[PDB]
Amino acid sequence: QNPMRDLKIEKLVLNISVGESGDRLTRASKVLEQLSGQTPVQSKARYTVRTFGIRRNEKIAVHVTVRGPKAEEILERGLKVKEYQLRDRNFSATGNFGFGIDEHIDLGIKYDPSIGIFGMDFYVVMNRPGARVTRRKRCKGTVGNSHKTTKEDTVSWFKQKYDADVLDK
Amino acid sequence: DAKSSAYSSRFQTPFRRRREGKTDYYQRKRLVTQHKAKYNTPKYRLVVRFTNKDIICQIISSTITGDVVLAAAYSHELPRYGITHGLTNWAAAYATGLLIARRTLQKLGLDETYKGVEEVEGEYELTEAVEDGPRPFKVFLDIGLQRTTTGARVFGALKGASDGGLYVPHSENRFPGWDFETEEIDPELLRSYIFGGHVSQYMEELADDDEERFSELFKGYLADDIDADSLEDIYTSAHEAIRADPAFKPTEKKFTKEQYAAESKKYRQTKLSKEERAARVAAKIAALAGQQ
Amino acid sequence: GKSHGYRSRTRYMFQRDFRKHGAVHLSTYLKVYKVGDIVDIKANGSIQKGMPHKFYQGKTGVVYNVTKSSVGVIINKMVGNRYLEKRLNLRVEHIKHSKCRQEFLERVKANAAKRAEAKAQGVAVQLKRQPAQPRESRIVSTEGNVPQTLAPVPYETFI
Amino acid sequence: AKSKNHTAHNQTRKAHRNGIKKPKTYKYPSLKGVDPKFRRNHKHALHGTAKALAAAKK
Amino acid sequence: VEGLRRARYKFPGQQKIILSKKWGFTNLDRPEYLKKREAGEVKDDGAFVKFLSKKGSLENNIREFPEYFA
RNA sequence: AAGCGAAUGAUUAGAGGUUCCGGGGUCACCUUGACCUAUUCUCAAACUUUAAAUAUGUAAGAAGUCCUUGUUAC
RNA sequence: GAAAUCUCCAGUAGAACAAAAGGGUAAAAGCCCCCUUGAUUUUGAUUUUCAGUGUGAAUACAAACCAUGAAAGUGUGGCC
RNA sequence: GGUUGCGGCCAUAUCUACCAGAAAGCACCGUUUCCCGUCCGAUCAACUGUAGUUAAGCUGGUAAGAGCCUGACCGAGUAGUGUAGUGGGUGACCAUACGCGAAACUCAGGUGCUGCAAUCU
Ligand SMILES: [Mg+2]
Ligand SMILES: [Mg+2]
Ligand SMILES: [Mg+2]
Ligand SMILES: [Mg+2]
Ligand SMILES: [Mg+2]
Ligand SMILES: [Mg+2]
Ligand SMILES: [Mg+2]
Ligand SMILES: [Mg+2]
């Protein structure tokens, strides 16, 4: 209908969350370093609950953000593991989606410290050209309703190339 | 969703230009407010603004009814001086600052004195007040919502205007060639970027590296047969032409504003009157009540 | 015990107006104040520096000093059985020009012009203002306006 | 023993028995509290106008 | 009337018994409510009623009060 | 004084919207609580969009107004 | 998992701003980061309490000397 | 008349939904050698106006639209209130006389105006 009205993978955030901190976080950092190819960022604790074994500001998690082509190659690598099987859930009403995997270290061979299974949260953010108007410092504005990414638009975009299906089991 | 009526009634809107995201009123207050014991002395502001495709350089004072432009200079008028390419790159911003400086000094008759840095070297300099003569014209840089970066184009327009012979206070902390690890300037690097050295060195490197992207970018240089080497020469000749006549010849303005008004008056949807609004609501009822 | 701090009993006086919080508009900062200008005092609770004490809210004074961001104002304050001169250092935000003085100057200009034109003819052209006068006589016709009205009405509960 | 704590009764009658008075304006008020920079330069400006008038009149 | 006259004895002071000219608990006179009901300007609700006004979005004013506009 | 189908805080009553929010009740049940929506009765010294009366500040000129132009290190 | 991290949407402040309460504050006065010592020197003027005494607290300048910022500017302790 | 830059007043300007927009401008938009900033040229920087698109931003229009604004012998001279009486009433309170005088409500209309400079079938 218009080339500027095309879905695109704006972002691919990649998250790991640990109940404690230490060498678990450090290896949670190398597993992100090897795949993304860039330094991951660790996260503080917003507040302490004394039931999940977490204290404020102790670096309990790690996550890294990837964009452009690399987000596509990583996404296909992670979706072949799921065999392109997602649900009716896992697609947010704002047009983003995501899933989770565990122990894909059998691909991307580093020295392979294969001592410890890591789960891994893929979340992907979809946008069309013009998302800059909501992020730029000057004259920041809000995307019009027609241009907004929705869950149906993301589902159709997925059911196209990436040749997948949803709501199944 | 679901904006409640009480939310709407109790909502206080920002100032219009804050809603539009153009004016920073925190910075504008300190930019504009004058010492009350200088009762009616204007405080002049070098507004430097970058769109895509253009650089707007204006000297602006403030009144209650609105702002006043002492002088205006634009990057799109640089063709009549010699630069038709890169009308937004850092050297073009320098030439626009040089232009607004020479133009404002000519308008105020303060150009025989305060001729500024005639020969560019890249050194850090201020318009010094002459002995027993008039003080240099005072202007303070305004950059709006632009972030402050060592090497940003606003400070290139700042540098050009300073060299143009108007007094604009500034440090050298944000020019290209400054190092945070070693607090000093690179006069040679600053000068080279003033004369387009960054983009000229780019097309030099790009030409050998790969010619297809050297044909996509810098297509216009190829089109009119401009080498990288001549970019230094054209900027030098353009600064001299700017110093020759900064007079601002305006456009001949074909199709006078009355028929601009006439032609653009037929592309705006007219507001429907209150009677026609009653007709529209009556028609919507009547179609709905027609028993299908 | 009792409490008499500087800003006591200012809960409402130093309120911003409703839907009128935020930054002060630039007109208040671009207004010029000279010595002898008559100004009104109204504190802006957003600007905590250079505030008038709550006694001076609504008082009208004369500018005697002009500094960078502020104005010196002379106010006459009734202390016991006499008035005392008070000098206030107020930032421009808590200050506005009084429209009484501007309108009196307008009358002074109009008096001058009327005097200048009267010197051509018509001595004693009544420069002074006058209190509102009793009405002159008049004739009220009934053409299309015949008097017609009823009496007081009976009592009904309406509830 | 207890007694009255405070009252402004009779206070306006006392205040008015000698006619609450205005502060008796003058030409040339005190330049107390004026900005010192202005005040310093006003001294020299007045010195110069004194010289000019004295030369003009003699 | 008798119920309220018997309740008056439990209150201090003076109380009066007034027959209202309003329809039930509404703020409408009896003929005014009658002409606002015979024309479909009155909609039943839980125990009170909602009224039709010429203000607001039409779609709501037809979705609600569908008997009107006939 | 007014207001509460305006914010805050109180407060009566039902309507509509069918939600892994301990409704027992099929394994989609008039016999359920909340939450949201449009309504409804009643309130506030330490609530409020509004907002009086009375009281209260200033001005109503020669120490003024207009014109020309002398001083200054501001 | 209702409460761990990650992403987007709405969000006039319903948060936060050491401490009572009230006022104020949204490209901030809140949060994070960089730099700092103006929480400094010397006098006077002023506001509040008021006798127009003191004490406290505060305001606007002046002469220095500085901090920060690209700059206007701001800063003579703590948003009031 | 459109548009841009800088504004003044700061909703008649806001919010929701939906349709339009010639030219120019603005915009989205192409790239990462350079100066700079990132976990990430997303933001910020720089470079080419080149590869493209009015899709969005933006502007305007529609809405018995919400909100907002203005008026009304709308409610209402009502509530309240200054002054007075050896007025009424056991009181609570109330009436009257000379003055001032609301808010809610109900209709009605309206939905930015404007300054400086530049530019545009
Ligand atoms: Mg700033
Ligand atoms: Mg107190
Ligand atoms: Mg005693
Ligand atoms: Mg009351
Ligand atoms: Mg602080
Ligand atoms: Mg302080
Ligand atoms: Mg990009
Ligand atoms: Mg008596």
Contact B50, B43 (CB under 8 A): no
Q: How far is CA C146 from the centre of its chain?
A: 45
Taking the C-alpha atoms of residue D40 and residue D36, their distance in angstroms, rounded to an integer, is 6
Using CA atoms in the order E38, E39, E45, E48, what is the torsion angle rounded to 10 degrees? -70
Q: Which H or E element spans position B285?
A: helix B274-288
Give the position of tokens 């020479």.
B102
Taking the C-alpha atoms of residue C64 and residue C43, their distance in angstroms, rounded to an integer, is 19
| Cβ within 8 Å of residue B4, ≥6 positions away | none
Strands (E), B44-187: 45-51, 54-62, 67-74, 140-142
Taking the C-alpha atoms of residue A167 and residue A152, their distance in angstroms, rounded to an integer, is 13
Q: Which nucleotides of H are covered by protein (CB under 7 A)?
A: 1-2, 4-11, 13-23, 25-31, 33-37, 39-68, 91-92, 107-121
Q: How was this model experimentally determined? A: cryo-EM
Coil, strand or helix: which one is C73?
Answer: strand
Taking the C-alpha atoms of residue D17 and residue A136, their distance in angstroms, rounded to an integer, is 72
Residue D55: both structure tokens together: 């030369």
Coil, strand or helix: which one is A121?
Answer: strand
Residue C111: both structure tokens together: 């008096």
Strand duo A119-127 + C82-91: pairing? unpaired
Burial class (CB in 10 A: 0-12, 13-18, 19+), B34: middle
Strand duo E42-44 + A119-127: pairing? unpaired
Strand order in the sheet with B54-62: B67-74, B54-62, B45-51, B140-142
Contact C87, C104 (CB under 8 A): no
Number of cross-chain residue pairs from C and E with Cβ atoms under 8 Å apart = 6
> Which one-letter amino acid corresponds to residue B113?
T
Q: Which of C25, C29, C33 sits opposite B33 (nearest CB)?
A: C29
Residue C105: both structure tokens together: 């100057």
Residue nearest H44, CA–C1′ metric: B147
Q: Is the CB of D33 less than 8 angstroms away from the CB of C87?
A: yes
Taking the C-alpha atoms of residue A69 and residue B84, their distance in angstroms, rounded to an integer, is 35
B255 interfacial to chain C (CB closer than 8 Å): no
Closest Cα in chain B to A133:
B21
Cβ-based contacts of B32 with chain C (< 8 Å): 26, 29-30
Residue C140's CB is within 10 A of a number of other CB atoms, namely: 6
As beta bridge partners, residue B48 has B57
| Cβ within 8 Å of residue A117, ≥6 positions away | A102, A103
User: CA nearest B100: which of B236, B243, B251?
Assistant: B243
Contact B156, B93 (CB under 8 A): yes
Taking the C-alpha atoms of residue C68 and residue B233, their distance in angstroms, rounded to an integer, is 48
Taking the C-alpha atoms of residue B130 and residue B144, their distance in angstroms, rounded to an integer, is 31
Coil, strand or helix: which one is D14?
Answer: helix
Residue A86's CB is within 10 A of a number of other CB atoms, namely: 21
Taking the C-alpha atoms of residue A28 and residue A25, their distance in angstroms, rounded to an integer, is 5
| Cβ within 8 Å of residue E70, ≥6 positions away | B289, E40
Distance in angstroms: CA C112, C1' F66: 9
User: Which residues 1-58 of chain D have a CB under 7 Å from nucleic chain F?
Assistant: 25-27, 37-38, 40-41, 44-49, 51-52
Residue B147: both structure tokens together: 């972030």
Number of residues assigned to chain C: 159
Q: Specify the DSSP class assigned to residue B256.
A: -
Strand duo B140-142 + B45-51: pairing? parallel
User: Which residues 95-154 of chain C have a CB under 7 Å from nucleic chain G?
Assistant: none
Residue B164: both structure tokens together: 């143009």
Taking the C-alpha atoms of residue C125 and residue C105, their distance in angstroms, rounded to an integer, is 19
Cβ-based contacts of B47 with chain A (< 8 Å): none
Residue D34: both structure tokens together: 């004026």
Coil, strand or helix: which one is B51?
Answer: strand
Residue nearest G5, CA–C1′ metric: A17
Taking the C-alpha atoms of residue B131 and residue B136, their distance in angstroms, rounded to an integer, is 11
Query: Rounded to whole angstroms, what are the CA distances from B109 to B72, B114, B137, B162, B176?
Result: 16, 10, 11, 17, 32
Query: Rounded to whole angstroms, what are the CA distances from A102 to A118, A125, A149, C119?
Result: 6, 21, 29, 104
